[PDB]
Design a protein around this ligand. Structure first.
Ligand SMILES: CCCCCCCCOCCOCCOCCOCCO
Ligand SMILES: [Mg+2]
Length: 552
């Protein structure tokens, strides 16, 4: 201690007004009677601002200042009935009058008869000007912005007439900078054609496009407007990235432990925008190395070819595997957001399941679909992810066995009330075959872990053989529901239930259940999560899970 507690008395009770006054006055701070006495005129001023802000203008307040441990100041507030809107005229004229997606100011708070709330007028004004600016009505004017308050007789009039004038348009797109990327390529990632209606979110989209292309270390995408129609030219300057970039990352997980990730990427090999890359990751239970080549199709960023090769060693609970892979991928995304990937992958796997050593190889075609819909990036308000992937093989036809491998995931997040979050997770997997023994670990299914079924260690939920070794399931499911309570900014308190298992028979899934609670912390890289989970099934003890990365 000590800090001098603020006190608001509203007769008769009005929680809204009270909380507003409390927010407006702010913190009294530490001591004292005298300092509080000086603060009184400010306190009454702020309080009456808050009343005026909620429509109470025949607001009559009184300050009281008491001393003690700590001190305190009691404001008595009394609110004459509020000022209700009589006339409200909100008009958007000009070209904007005809724009479909131009939201007119609406809602309960701007209806006649309603108590005047702080900034509803300004909210409306801000909305109009924001959409004006988004859609390129730069010659857009407020012909009329009148707010009238007669506290007495309790009347308020709103008048917003907004002449938007003519709409500007996208001009030429120009590219300068030490980039060797052909303008043929750069123009196919401009998300607009010339003579098309201006949209600042399209400029943003272009900026993020160029940034995400990997081609540069910097882009200056600017389209400032011009005087009193025209056509706003867009200037893009590109700094070719250093031709060979290196990156190193450290991470940790309960699943795999300490982890190191490295990448050494060439972001442009030639003028046609081809991309080269290498990457590896080292952890005690798993080490892998990969190389890749990418060819932008059209659009370059959502449609592409990706060739890959890889080697991976893995020693987990009762299984070992050296896995070699080559592959070709074709990414294409439709306007929904549905990204398809058509693949042809060859794999050879040297493995030890329990004490039984195998080696098998498959050439499998596959098709996948993905969908990601979020509020944005670093933690979003609400969103979801859908993922579907099928691959298969015919023995004889470059396959040691017949295979129909299917895996699917669904992730979801919603925020409601004052920031209460709900998280949902489902994952399903299945492999069909006429030779299960020939099926290597990578094609089998495992469960448990930070991102699977908490309360259980990584990939430990699995069928066992004669001697009690975890060998892998033909199918698996893992689901989770989590509730998050905002405790502070960047701080949340979660409770969760996960259920899942990997198993060979649909009739006896023997689903295991872990339940628990943890802490979420929003760092700048991402949401770190630390959970304490109790296994309800098998012989359940307690388990600490730790993980890094986005919620979705
Ligand atoms: C478009 C929104 C996408 C979000 C979908 C979230 C799906 C989350 O579902 C959680 C329930 O999953 C079921 C888990 O099943 C485990 C085994 O069932 C219990 C058997 O005893
Ligand atoms: Mg160029």
């Amino acid at each position: 201690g000590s800090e001098s507690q603020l006190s608001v008395r509203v007769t008769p009770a009005n929680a809204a007004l009270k909380a507003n006054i409390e927010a407006y006055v702010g913190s009294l701070g530490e001591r004292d009677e005298a300092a509080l006495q000086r603060f009184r005129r400010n306190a009454e001023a702020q309080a009456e601002k808050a009343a005026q802000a909620l429509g109470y203008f025949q607001a009559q307040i009184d300050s009281e200042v008491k001393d003690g441990k700590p001190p305190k100041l009691t404001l008595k507030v009394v609110p004459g009935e509020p000022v209700r809107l009589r006339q409200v005229n909100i008009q958007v004229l000009g070209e904007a009058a005809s724009l479909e997606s131009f939201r007119l100011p609406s809602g309960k708070q701007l209806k006649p008869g309603a108590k005047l709330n702080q900034g509803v007028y300004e909210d409306a004004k801000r909305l109009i000007q924001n959409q004006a600016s988004r859609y390129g009505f730069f010659q857009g004017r407020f012909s009329t912005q009148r707010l009238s308050i007669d506290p007495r007789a309790g009347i308020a009039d709103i008048d917003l007439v907004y002449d938007s004038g003519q709409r500007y348009t996208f001009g030429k797109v120009s590219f300068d900078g030490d980039s060797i990327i052909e303008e043929e390529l750069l123009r196919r990632m401009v998300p607009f054609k010339a003579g098309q209606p201006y949209d600042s979110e399209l400029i943003a989209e272009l900026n993020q496009n160029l940034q995400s292309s990997g081609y540069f270390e910097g882009v200056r995408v600017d389209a400032a407007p011009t005087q009193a129609r025209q056509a706003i030219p867009v200037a893009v300057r590109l700094e070719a990235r250093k031709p060979r970039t290196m990156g190193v990352g450290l991470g940790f997980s309960t699943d795999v432990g300490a982890r190191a990730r490295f990448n050494w990427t060439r972001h442009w090999v030639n003028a046609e925008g081809h991309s080269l890359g290498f990457e590896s990751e080292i952890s005690a239970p798993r080490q892998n190395v990969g190389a890749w080549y990418e060819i932008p199709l059209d659009p370059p960023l959502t449609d592409k070819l990706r060739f890959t090769s890889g080697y991976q060693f893995e020693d987990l609970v009762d299984t070992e595997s050296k896995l070699l892979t080559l592959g070709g991928e074709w990414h294409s995304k439709r306007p929904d957001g549905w990204q398809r990937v058509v693949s042809l992958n060859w794999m050879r796997e040297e493995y030890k399941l329990g004490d039984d050593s195998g080696l098998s190889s498959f050439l499998m075609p596959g098709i996948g679909y993905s969908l990601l819909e979020t509020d944005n990036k670093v933690d979003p308000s609400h969103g979801y992810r859908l993922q579907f992937n099928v691959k298969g093989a015919k023995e004889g036809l470059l396959a040691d066995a017949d295979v129909l491998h299917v895996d699917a995931m669904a992730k979801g997040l919603t925020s409601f009330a004052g920031g209460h979050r709900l998280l949902g997770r489902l994952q399903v997997g299945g492999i069909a075959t006429n030779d299960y023994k020939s099926i290597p670990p990578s094609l089998r299914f495992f469960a448990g872990g930070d991102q699977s079924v908490r309360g259980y260690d990584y990939r430990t939920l699995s069928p066992e053989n004669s001697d009690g070794d975890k060998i892998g399931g033909r199918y698996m499911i893992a689901g989770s529901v989590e509730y998050q309570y905002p405790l502070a900014e960047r701080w949340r308190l979660a409770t969760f239930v996960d259920q899942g298992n990997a198993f060979n028979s649909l009739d006896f899934p023997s689903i295991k259940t872990g339940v628990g609670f943890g802490v979420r912390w929003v760092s700048p890289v991402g949401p770190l999560r630390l959970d304490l989970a109790h296994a309800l099934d098998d012989d359940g003890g307690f388990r600490l899970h730790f993980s890094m990365g986005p919620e979705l």
